[PDB]
Every structure is written in structure tokens, then in C-alpha cells.
Design a protein around this nucleic acid. Structure first.
Ligand SMILES: [Mg+2]
Ligand SMILES: [Mg+2]
Ligand SMILES: [Mg+2]
Ligand SMILES: [Mg+2]
Ligand SMILES: [Mg+2]
Ligand SMILES: [Mg+2]
Ligand SMILES: [Mg+2]
Ligand SMILES: [Mg+2]
Ligand SMILES: [Mg+2]
Ligand SMILES: [Mg+2]
Ligand SMILES: [Mg+2]
Ligand SMILES: [Mg+2]
Ligand SMILES: [Mg+2]
Ligand SMILES: [Mg+2]
Ligand SMILES: [Mg+2]
Ligand SMILES: [Mg+2]
Ligand SMILES: [Mg+2]
Ligand SMILES: [Mg+2]
Lengths: 88, 115, 73
RNA sequence: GGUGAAAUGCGCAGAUACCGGGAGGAACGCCGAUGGCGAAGGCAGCCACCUGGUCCACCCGUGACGCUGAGGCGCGAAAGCGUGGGGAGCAAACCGGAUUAGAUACCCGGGUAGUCCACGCCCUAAACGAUGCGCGCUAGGUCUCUGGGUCUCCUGGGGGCCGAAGCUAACGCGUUAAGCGCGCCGCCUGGGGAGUACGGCCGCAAGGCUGAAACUCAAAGGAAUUGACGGGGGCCCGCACAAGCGGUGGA
């Protein structure tokens, strides 16, 4: 799955100051990581529809924090959507 | 034929019948008998007085080979199940140990309609 | 009343996950290999959901029997 | 063997019962609980692995980012189709035997589909708490699963039963609301005709979705009450039956 230290990575590699356990960006990330161990886990286990759920409540949950950032600051967005390289 | 001291008693109690095959400490069919061999023809066969009877005519073919001791085994819950068990303590045969070992799935085969 | 004695008091302490503790885990079966009904054992809501996947372990490793036959006793 | 009783059926090419070995398929006994989890269909033998949801604690972080959703997208038991495997046991259709006035059934002995795996379809249901989805407020009592604490008790999240206030046609609901209010959704508008027809839409097909009218009837309904009634039960009595005596029916 994931452990603390790989998490740690994405956290501090992203936080807008040190101990920002969660800003917006942090979370837009953490999911990105989780979605992605999930895209795979599914990309072979095609018959696990059950977890496909959790994926989408996550595909989802991201897309709001997305817009939230599009609204309260569009630069810190431009920077968060290159730094993870999404849309598509 | 041969002679055998210790031998073991198998009892199979259904509903339409009750069957006693008696054997030797391996499990080899010395003499066997059920109610339908006693003279009973249809639903007659399952009576507790038929089970008492098979465990006579089977235990009588078995003293014919000089039977001394028995251990008993029983397969089922059926009409006169223990009526044969008693019918053996009552025939003139040391009843060693008495054991039940009924076929008990751990849920494999879907039984017929008639559950 | 089935008021003999449950097996929770008839022992010092032990672990419910040590599969091969077969001195103890023999007194959690019957005169069949059947895992004793929770009323006989007197185990918690957790406890006999643990002792469940225990004697299902210590069975495959032969130690504890799947079933027996029966002593008329 | 089978049944109310029996025959079709299997056995003197050796059946059943009985011991030892072997293959193969399908499910998972006891723990199994009024118990758990999940959005729903749904899920329990055991092991590991890849994962989803979720609760508790400390209140550390950003700082209203939140709710609901027409259409679109995905999941959706069972049967059903399609190509290919698999087929023990069960078992529509079907083959017989029995019952009955007749039995295309209830009962019995075989039997293909199929249930099983795959991969794509099918996309319905008494899919049911027949209660769409979030938040705020309103006596409590016991029970039960699961968390945290100074664990005689306190306090979170669940599943049940009884009850305040209040609602309700009544039943019953009852801090798991059918109580008191806010948001949004979909849905109803008298019974039959009818889940049909017309049209479009989806599928290979079986069919589904959306979904009327003409005409005809004064109803169709919902809970609830007193009875009557049951091849429903519980409890009493009469020469009602049995235990006994004597007759008719025949002359
Ligand atoms: Mg064998
Ligand atoms: Mg259900
Ligand atoms: Mg804080
Ligand atoms: Mg601040
Ligand atoms: Mg929504
Ligand atoms: Mg199916
Ligand atoms: Mg095939
Ligand atoms: Mg049949
Ligand atoms: Mg098929
Ligand atoms: Mg399939
Ligand atoms: Mg389907
Ligand atoms: Mg329909
Ligand atoms: Mg619903
Ligand atoms: Mg509660
Ligand atoms: Mg009241
Ligand atoms: Mg109540
Ligand atoms: Mg009308
Ligand atoms: Mg009389």
C-alpha cells in the first residue's frame, strides 16, 4: 500500500511551510498518490469493481480541492497542476 | 468356514430399513443382514421390530462362526436404531464399545428437493 | 442448566493465537471436533471469533481433530 | 431403494451394508449469535498478497473548500443468451411408476438445459426499512457489537427491543423518526383496460426502457371492530366415541 516515510516525502516536498501537515496542495497530492497505487491495483484486478468505488470518491474529492484553488488563487493552481501534471 | 474371536458390529439404520453387517477387527464382512432378508417386504422393513430381528439373524450367522466379542458401530438415526443395539446385548454377545459415526457433510452436496 | 463449568476459569492465562497449545485447545473441543458453543466456553465477543480461526489453523497442521466418532459413555 | 401404501429402478455379469486405495466436481459442518461489514444487489472453511470504506484518540494542519444532483458514466442477486472449457450433486423441459373420476401436478425412480470458471452481453425483482440524500433540535430505560478515558462508571460509533413529548386514518413511528424545522432530488393525481397499443431508444436474441387513449364500472383501496368460519391451535362437557347390555336393518 503506502507507509509513513514515502508519505512524508510527498508531504514535505509539497507543504507551503514546515508542519503544514495538510494545506490544500498536500491533499491534492496525497490522493494523487493513493489514486495511483489504485489505478494499477485495478489495471490488473479488472474485476475489483468494489475498490473502483473508492477510486472515484477520490477521483472526485481531488477535483473539488482543484476548483477551490482555481478560485482562491489561480497561480498556486498553475503551479500545482504542473507539479503533478494532471488534467490530460 | 473359519473361526473368529473378536469381531465388530456395523449397524445402518435408515427409515425404509435397518441393516447389520458384522465383521472382523479390520472391517471384513463376515455375515450381513437387514430386515428385508428376515422376511419383511415393504414398509414392514423399517419397524423397530425388524431392527431387533436383523441384529438377531445376523448375529446368529455370526455365532455360527463362533463369535465371542463385539464392538458396535452405528450409521444413522433411524427406526429402531438402538433397538438393534439392544438386540445385540440381548443375543448373547459381549458388547465392547458402542460408537456412532453418521455421514455428516461440511456442506458439499445440495440435497434433493425433498430436503 | 448446562451449569457445569466454562473453560475460561478452568485454566491459568494463555494466548488465543498460539495454534499448537494443544493441551488447552483440546478443552475447547467436544466429544466431536466441533468448536464449543460460546455458552460452553464463556468467551468474549472478540475472543471466540479469534479461537475460531485458531482451531481452524491448528487443524490443518493435524494437531487438533476435524471430527471424532462417539463414545457411548 | 422408495412411499401415506406401492410399483417403475438397481442386484447372482454379485447390488446394499462393509474395509483400503484412487480420480473428479461442488459447496464450506461446529465457531454462527436477536452478531459484523458493505451504497446497493451482496459476503462466512484455512493462508498470503493487491486494495476500498469506516470508527475511536490527541485537536496539530489549511480555512467554508460545504449539500443535492436533471441528463451523462459506472456497479446490479436470480434465471437468459454468446464462444470456449467443466459436469460430482441438484435439477425446468423430457422418460416412466404411483395416486385420483381425470393428474400434463402434490408423492417416487432416471433425465438435457443449467447452476461451476472464464471472457464479453442481458441491466429486471416483493432490488424491501416496500421509509431518496445531507445537517440542526426533542425524556429516557434495558440489551447487544466496536472503539477512547482519571475504566464502581464516564463518553464516541453501530445494530435491536420497550417507552416522554409529539405525529398518525389506524396499525404502529418513536434520538436508527413515520417527532419539530432548512436545502435539493425524483415520484403520485380514481379501478378496469395496462405495464398493452403507437413512436422512438437499447440488445445478437429472449426482451427491456420511456409509456398512452377510445370504451366500460361507482368504485378500486387502507388500516380497524363484532361476529361467522378453518382439512389453526390452547382449555372444558353431553351415553359425542370408546369400555358393557339389547335391538333394528333380514322374517
Ligand atoms: Mg473411500
Ligand atoms: Mg439483502
Ligand atoms: Mg487546530
Ligand atoms: Mg490560520
Ligand atoms: Mg451526490
Ligand atoms: Mg447467472
Ligand atoms: Mg459450454
Ligand atoms: Mg423427479
Ligand atoms: Mg452458459
Ligand atoms: Mg460471467
Ligand atoms: Mg445481471
Ligand atoms: Mg418491469
Ligand atoms: Mg432505497
Ligand atoms: Mg445506540
Ligand atoms: Mg403518547
Ligand atoms: Mg417502540
Ligand atoms: Mg381512467
Ligand atoms: Mg358402542
Amino acid at each position: 500500500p503506502i507507509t509513513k516515510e514515502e508519505k512524508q516525502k510527498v508531504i514535505q516536498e509539497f507543504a507551503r511551510f514546515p508542519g503544514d501537515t495538510g494545506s490544500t496542495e498536500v491533499q491534492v497530492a496525497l490522493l494523487t498518490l493513493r489514486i495511483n497505487r489504485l489505478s494499477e491495483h485495478l489495471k490488473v484486478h479488472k474485476k475489483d469493481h468494489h475498490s473502483h468505488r473508492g477510486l472515484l470518491m477520490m477521483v472526485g474529492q481531488r477535483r473539488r480541492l482543484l476548483r477551490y484553488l482555481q478560485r482562491e488563487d489561480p497561480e498556486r493552481y498553475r503551479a500545482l497542476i504542473e507539479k503533478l501534471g494532471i488534467r490530460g | 468356514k473359519r473361526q473368529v474371536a473378536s469381531g465388530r458390529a456395523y449397524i445402518h439404520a435408515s427409515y425404509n430399513n435397518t441393516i447389520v453387517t458384522i465383521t472382523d477387527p479390520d472391517g471384513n464382512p463376515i455375515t450381513w443382514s437387514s430386515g428385508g432378508v428376515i422376511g419383511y417386504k415393504g414398509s414392514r422393513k423399517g419397524t423397530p421390530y425388524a431392527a431387533q430381528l436383523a441384529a438377531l439373524d445376523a448375529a446368529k450367522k455370526a455365532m455360527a462362526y463362533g463369535m465371542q466379542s463385539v464392538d458396535v458401530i452405528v450409521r444413522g438415526t433411524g427406526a429402531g436404531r438402538e433397538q438393534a443395539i439392544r438386540a445385540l446385548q440381548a443375543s448373547g454377545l459381549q458388547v465392547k464399545s458402542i460408537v456412532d459415526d453418521t455421514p455428516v457433510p461440511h456442506n458439499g452436496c445440495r440435497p434433493k428437493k425433498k430436503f | 442448566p448446562s451449569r457445569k463449568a466454562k473453560v475460561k476459569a478452568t485454566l491459568g492465562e494463555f494466548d488465543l493465537r498460539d495454534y499448537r497449545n494443544v493441551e488447552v485447545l483440546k478443552r475447547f473441543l467436544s466429544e466431536t471436533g466441533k468448536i464449543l458453543p460460546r455458552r460452553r466456553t464463556g468467551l468474549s465477543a472478540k475472543e471466540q471469533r479469534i479461537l475460531a480461526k485458531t482451531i481452524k489453523r491448528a487443524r490443518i497442521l493435524g494437531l487438533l481433530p476435524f471430527t471424532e466418532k462417539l463414545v457411548r459413555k
